[PDB]
Symmetry: D2
Subunit: 259 residues, 4 copies
Amino acid sequence: SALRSTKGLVALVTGGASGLGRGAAENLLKHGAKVAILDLPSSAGAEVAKELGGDCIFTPASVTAASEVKSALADVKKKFGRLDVAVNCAGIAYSFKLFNVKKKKLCDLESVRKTLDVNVMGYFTVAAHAAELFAENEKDEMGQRGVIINTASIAAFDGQAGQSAYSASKGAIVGMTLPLARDFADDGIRVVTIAPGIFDTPMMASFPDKVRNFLIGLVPNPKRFGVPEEYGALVRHIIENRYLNGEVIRLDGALRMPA
Amino acid sequence: SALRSTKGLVALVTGGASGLGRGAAENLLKHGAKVAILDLPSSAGAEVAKELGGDCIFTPASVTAASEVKSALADVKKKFGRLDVAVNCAGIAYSFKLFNVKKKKLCDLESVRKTLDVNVMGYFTVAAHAAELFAENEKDEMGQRGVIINTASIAAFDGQAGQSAYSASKGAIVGMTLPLARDFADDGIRVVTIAPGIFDTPMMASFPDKVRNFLIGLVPNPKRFGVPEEYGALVRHIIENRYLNGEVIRLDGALRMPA
Amino acid sequence: SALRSTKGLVALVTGGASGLGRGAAENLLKHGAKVAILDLPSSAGAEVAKELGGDCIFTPASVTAASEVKSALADVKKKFGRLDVAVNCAGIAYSFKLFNVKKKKLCDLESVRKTLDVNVMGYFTVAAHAAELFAENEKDEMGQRGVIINTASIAAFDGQAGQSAYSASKGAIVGMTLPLARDFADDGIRVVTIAPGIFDTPMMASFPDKVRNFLIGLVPNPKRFGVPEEYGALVRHIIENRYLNGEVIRLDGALRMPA
Amino acid sequence: SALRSTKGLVALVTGGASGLGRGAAENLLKHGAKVAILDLPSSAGAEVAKELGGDCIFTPASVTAASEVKSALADVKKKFGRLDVAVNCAGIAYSFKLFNVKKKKLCDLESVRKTLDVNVMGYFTVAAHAAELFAENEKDEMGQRGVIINTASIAAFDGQAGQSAYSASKGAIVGMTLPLARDFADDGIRVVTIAPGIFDTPMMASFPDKVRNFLIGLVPNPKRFGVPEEYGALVRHIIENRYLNGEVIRLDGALRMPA
Ligand SMILES: NC(=O)c1ccc[n+]([C@@H]2O[C@H](COP(=O)([O-])OP(=O)(O)OC[C@H]3O[C@@H](n4cnc5c(N)ncnc54)[C@H](O)[C@@H]3O)[C@@H](O)[C@H]2O)c1
Ligand SMILES: NC(=O)c1ccc[n+]([C@@H]2O[C@H](COP(=O)([O-])OP(=O)(O)OC[C@H]3O[C@@H](n4cnc5c(N)ncnc54)[C@H](O)[C@@H]3O)[C@@H](O)[C@H]2O)c1
Ligand SMILES: NC(=O)c1ccc[n+]([C@@H]2O[C@H](COP(=O)([O-])OP(=O)(O)OC[C@H]3O[C@@H](n4cnc5c(N)ncnc54)[C@H](O)[C@@H]3O)[C@@H](O)[C@H]2O)c1
Ligand SMILES: NC(=O)c1ccc[n+]([C@@H]2O[C@H](COP(=O)([O-])OP(=O)(O)OC[C@H]3O[C@@H](n4cnc5c(N)ncnc54)[C@H](O)[C@@H]3O)[C@@H](O)[C@H]2O)c1
């Protein structure tokens, strides 16, 4: 077969203590992978990795701290010997207008900087160090050494009012996908991005039932939030068929976020 | 699990006697689907369906002939009892300039009409009649009755010189994806499109080794043509992962067809 | 200056008896161009060209009839000596579902074929014959001989329920833009496409006040339908700055057509 | 007419001492605008504003410094009384691989942060403070108070090897366009983005003649670099044609940057 198994592959998943990252971790472990969850010391990463078993470790690190990402990845190398997959999933989401015209108040622009730091700089930091570990691998049967899977958002395409900073960070992840795939083409490292629609994760837990019902009403079909396993399954499919590369895949039940 | 098995699903694959359609047919059959290949009486469809075994039938028909498509789908219903999946894959590809400026000669405009008839009208015809069969299903646990998977091409986005007619037909398939997913949203019929890059099929059989090497040189990574099983694997993932809807997925090794 | 004047350029505008085509004709005549309006004998083309003055002629033709397009363009050559601009604007719009699931009724697929014939085949027919006339021109200061401006629609990107055939035809026009620009690159013929949002034209005159108010409510800003002059002005800008090529330009007041 | 004149409009152009920003500044000045160029104290902004005459001022500031941007825009208000237009044009471009696989060396990740700071944070800072000034205008006859024009790049879509950071910053600008247009929709502030191809500016001054010839060879038609006046002409068209909103316009001679 031209498709490979996930069995015995080593994957790092940032933001893996929660939501979509945890969904990807569970799906990969379920199909025989070793998984390191990278998440904040304040996260529940230790408890999550414990419940997920002996093929799952928790490497605490902030993706905005390059030295912490370096050491987390060096612990992955010590524990599992190699890295095959890096899943960029950690991210934060703000909602604010740049200038409230009615009340004449400027936003806090540092909220733009923090969004860009976690959601973009963290992806570059994790991608750079993952590539360093991949370069230790021998090219496999397909000439491959690793794959980087980034988590953007349909906000990169359908950004709503209040989301300019978030949509900018997600559009940055869209824009980096193809040049990075081109950078690593002859090194055998693919780069693919998933753009989820609305998924039922802690990121959406602040919303009350009225807002949840309104957001579900917008999703054409299936008429529900996505579930983390469906994101994890798409992550797994990218891992298994090597001809996916340099592309952004919308996973959203045909949602287009309205004005 | 939120992802379903392919086992027992009944799939119609147009163009199924060759190339990508045959790739999708074989992949679904190997994962337990019942597959009907719809292809031209002049094709090798009978022998191919024999090769693929007892879970495969050949329904001869031209996708440009509404009465033949309706007849073929009635045969699918008679044989397998229902329809779950329709893969629009049949298509043709010409190469010509609309006006040769150096020689002062107009193209054969009916070559554009034929491209549009097979590549677009055929998809609309198959989709409408597949929808008729889906409407006889009960909604499953995800609220679904069927899924239509269209094969566009990255020529819809990267159209090369000589490809205006082919690119137009493939751009049409891209454009139809979201409104059709919206049409059938509350009916539980998803519509998803795959945009393949260059794949090793009889469509490319004419090209001599020098052209093959040149085209391979363009693909960043994996540095090869796609193989039909990778297209069929993506078809199956769309079948199993219900939150994919209304999207176009490039499957192309990061290729961007140049000028 | 690197930008040229419209003064003394010869432009053909299909669908020019009405709506956006007439808007482009008026804007070009207002800025010193000779304009031939191509439209159906049933249209008001003769009356419109009369009111638009002696720099405007009416060449009756159906864009689905290649021989009628050939003769219209040969009359443009007799009347004005040359062709500099061809604006593809004629189009038709249907609204229908491919299969009404509630009442179990298939659409009339010939409505798909007619949509594709007028909206796509007509653009190819007009583009081919315009190119033939352009090839008679000497390359200008910028190396250019002509420009083809196609009118797609944001339905090529935001297609709503009921619009699958229309969105397919408009996605076909999107897809043809880049390969045609590449075809004619070294012949000096640019190809650019405009994707209008909702404009106040006879195409939208069937809608009652309640529907009009609903459609206006969807347009973020300016909160109104576009006016034909704004489409005509963008057509003119494409004519005047030669570095626009191979692109589709949304002209829509930030509208995204919702589910 | 639905298209307004540029005469009397007050425009701030960041990066206005060079290249495309200077191109936009000169075009608006020649059509009667008051223009303030915002650029670094180390730039030639003072001399350039002298060249451009009495309707041009130089407001020194770094777009990464919110207090300097606010101060510069207060100067614009003091001198010209209001603000109608803000052109985000200032930006930097690095070229580097995230990990050199052959030499086993990580990139300087702070080069990514600087790219994002100037190219994205600077656009957000200028946009927020420009919005503050727009909010002091009365709505004009089209209901508008201002327009923000961002300069992305086709690297947002065609990112080459070595360009991941630059492409990310330009993809961020693409992503921010629609949500910002939605943010300010009822306030009458449009947001439009231009994605230039390769233009003849000091950003490309380092490249020797062999690289220039190679890059020119890639542009289909016109087969040359863009000149800054063509960028300024498109800026002016967006200023005058109010139905352009929430869109990204490629201005690139049909170039698609290859692998
Ligand atoms: N959930 C959705 O509906 C949705 C939609 C589109 C895209 N996304 C994207 O999906 C990704 C995952 O979202 P989610 O729903 O799982 O969110 P979540 O809040 O459930 O999980 C985010 C995780 O990131 C971690 N994290 C935050 N900052 C970090 C840092 N500096 N270093 C390391 N880890 C850090 C958090 O601790 C948390 O565990 C994000 O990038 C988000 O933007 C989410
Ligand atoms: N092969 C590639 O590199 C590639 C990449 C881009 C897109 N595609 C698309 O993939 C699809 C499959 O192409 P392929 O590579 O498998 O080509 P292929 O020639 O191997 O197979 C196409 C099949 O379509 C059938 N067909 C043609 N006209 C038909 C009609 N009127 N009715 C019914 N069947 C008809 C043919 O009999 C043939 O078996 C097409 O839609 C094509 O445009 C192919
Ligand atoms: N108006 C909108 O809101 C809108 C939005 C998106 C795109 N468009 C596109 O803009 C273009 C113009 O639309 P409009 O609003 O001006 O419509 P319209 O109905 O006002 O004008 C269409 C014109 O096309 C002509 N035409 C039709 N069939 C023809 C044929 N076979 N040969 C020659 N002429 C023919 C008609 O006679 C008519 O004058 C169309 O292509 C349409 O799809 C319209
Ligand atoms: N030139 C091209 O080929 C091309 C194509 C794609 C995109 N672009 C984009 O066009 C824009 C303009 O680039 P250009 O070609 O005119 O380059 P340029 O180098 O000629 O001009 C850029 C100007 O930005 C100013 N600038 C830099 N950092 C600044 C800061 N912190 N604060 C204020 N001003 C600052 C510089 O002083 C300089 O004058 C950029 O955003 C660039 O990414 C350029």
